[PDB]
Subunit: 122 residues, 2 copies
């Protein structure tokens, strides 16, 4: 008899949770799972992400997450029309271009709070 | 044709990645998946956690993750013999006691780097 770990949920951070949730749902297509004032959960297909409140901006600026997807080029097309593809010369939410990395074919997305999330082709 | 998100991997943070990895593997039973100098991955059963390097200690002190498990009381017993159960009066790695929260029956564990990970009974 040994304990089995079954699944994990990344936690993104934000000084402004409510705005982080508005962005992931109204713009990226996730749904609200639950929303407290300093803690929320959003969901899309089999992926859940939690969003937690923090006071220091450097935390969200250093927060990361990796998500796997079937149909990466299409996610990229779906999101490129609501998120800038000029990842460098941009201050707000942005997306890098698809490229190969050791973990696979991917692209990263920075949300309004500063979280950087990597989406990888399954 | 719509992109489907299939799974996610939480990213823990540490000023000292190598030590964070030693702890999650030699003491908690995870295996090394890959180890670069400022980025690593550990695995146990169906759960993978990445560990990333940062310079500011406040990031790991604010980093969170949620993991689900079958056989929570047994994970608690397996880990209570290598991690302190005096969560308050302790400075290093520690574990709180099992309690009910809105997300379910759980316990939290703080690792040496400062990450706080919640383990929930499936």
């Amino acid at each position: 008899f040994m304990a089995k770990l079954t699944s994990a949920v990344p936690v993104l951070t934000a000084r402004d949770v409510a705005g982080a949730v508005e962005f992931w749902t109204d713009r990226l297509g996730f749904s609200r799972d639950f929303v407290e004032d300093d803690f929320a959960g959003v969901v899309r297909d089999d992926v859940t992400l939690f969003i937690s409140a923090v006071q220091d901006q450097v935390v969200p600026d250093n927060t990361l997450a990796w998500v796997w997807v079937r149909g990466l080029d299409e996610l990229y097309a779906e999101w490129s029309e609501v998120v800038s593809t000029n990842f460098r010369d941009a201050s707000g939410p942005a997306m890098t271009e698809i490229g190969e990395q050791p973990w696979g074919r991917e692209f990263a997305l920075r949300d309004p709070a500063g979280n950087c999330v990597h989406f990888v082709a399954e």
